[PDB]
Design a protein around this ligand. Sequence first.
Ligand SMILES: C[C@]12CCC(=O)C[C@@H]1CC[C@@H]1[C@@H]2CC[C@]2(C)[C@@H](O)CC[C@@H]12
Ligand SMILES: C[C@]12CCC(=O)C[C@@H]1CC[C@@H]1[C@@H]2CC[C@]2(C)[C@@H](O)CC[C@@H]12
Ligand SMILES: [Ca+2]
Ligand SMILES: [Ca+2]
Ligand SMILES: [Zn+2]
Ligand SMILES: [Zn+2]
Ligand SMILES: [Zn+2]
Ligand SMILES: [Zn+2]
Lengths: 172, 172
Amino acid sequence: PPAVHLSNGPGQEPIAVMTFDLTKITKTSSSFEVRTWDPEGVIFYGDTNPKDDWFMLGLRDGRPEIQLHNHWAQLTVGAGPRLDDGRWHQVEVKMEGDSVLLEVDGEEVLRLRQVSGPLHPIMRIALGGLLFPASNLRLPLVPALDGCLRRDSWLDKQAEISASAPTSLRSC
Amino acid sequence: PPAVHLSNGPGQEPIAVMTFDLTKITKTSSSFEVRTWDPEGVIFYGDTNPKDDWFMLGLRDGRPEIQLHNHWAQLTVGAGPRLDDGRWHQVEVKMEGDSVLLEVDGEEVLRLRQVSGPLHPIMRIALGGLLFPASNLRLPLVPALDGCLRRDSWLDKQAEISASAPTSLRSC
Ligand SMILES: C[C@]12CCC(=O)C[C@@H]1CC[C@@H]1[C@@H]2CC[C@]2(C)[C@@H](O)CC[C@@H]12
Ligand SMILES: C[C@]12CCC(=O)C[C@@H]1CC[C@@H]1[C@@H]2CC[C@]2(C)[C@@H](O)CC[C@@H]12
Ligand SMILES: [Ca+2]
Ligand SMILES: [Ca+2]
Ligand SMILES: [Zn+2]
Ligand SMILES: [Zn+2]
Ligand SMILES: [Zn+2]
Ligand SMILES: [Zn+2]
């Protein structure tokens, strides 16, 4: 299937930004396959507020890292196996009650409990980069992730209000 | 290549809406292939203003029809061969100086001269439907077009600010 490149050029901004109507979402999960040799970068960022309520999933030292900041919880966590072996890996990020679950190749590798109150009119999902400077993360990293993404599904497509790509979505 | 369906269900609204930054456009042309048995419908609508400055390309009696309303020109024109034979046809709509050109299967079939002043911050392109009730056209038609679209390219992708799909883009 058609794989896209997770970072154009110098990796300063996301390849794509989706905007979702929060009252319309009935699917609170995302899933995709990624392939990379890059140990560090952003895979995707999500927010309901860029100052207040945000999430990032990336790689640090080859392994998944989640940063989360909202009314309930503020955290920086690494978990799961290294993904930076150049092989395709399946990833799923799900909200299940008040938890956020991370699954890798079908196996749960992480569960952040007591982090989310009820699913802030709009949620944005940014692929390959953040919607704020990396310096404002809890723990900065260099956002550019040189890898591929394919078979991706972001929340509930029925609730997507719009999608923007700043430049050209490149092939992998 | 992947063809999409030009009308979901009862054909009241477009399948997809693209928004473009008018100062950024350097390509003032659009092109696509269509396949249909339906003699009447909208193929695409474009506006810089839904009251003031709009364009529609559709079929009426099987044949291309353009409606255009702007500061320079107000018109309803039919031209070209019937397209409602269920075969793939190549269509290109281009602005060339102050004209709007329509080409079918590589051949110019229509040139609307003296219709456009210089290429209103934003242009919208709506596929398969209008962004106003069909009753407000110069000459109403029933907008639903049961056909396929593939190999489509809309203006200058570098100038696209966002794209929205209200429901599910179906396969053809
Ligand atoms: C991980 C989730 C939920 C699961 C998913 O598909 C992606 C998405 C990313 C944005 C997160 C969201 C869970 C709830 C959060 C953390 C909000 O509190 C603010 C950002 C939201
Ligand atoms: C046909 C054009 C120009 C060529 C094209 O690719 C599609 C686009 C549709 C909107 C039209 C535009 C030409 C200029 C118009 C007619 C403006 O005056 C208002 C709507 C614009
Ligand atoms: Ca990197
Ligand atoms: Ca019809
Ligand atoms: Zn909040
Ligand atoms: Zn794996
Ligand atoms: Zn005007
Ligand atoms: Zn033909």
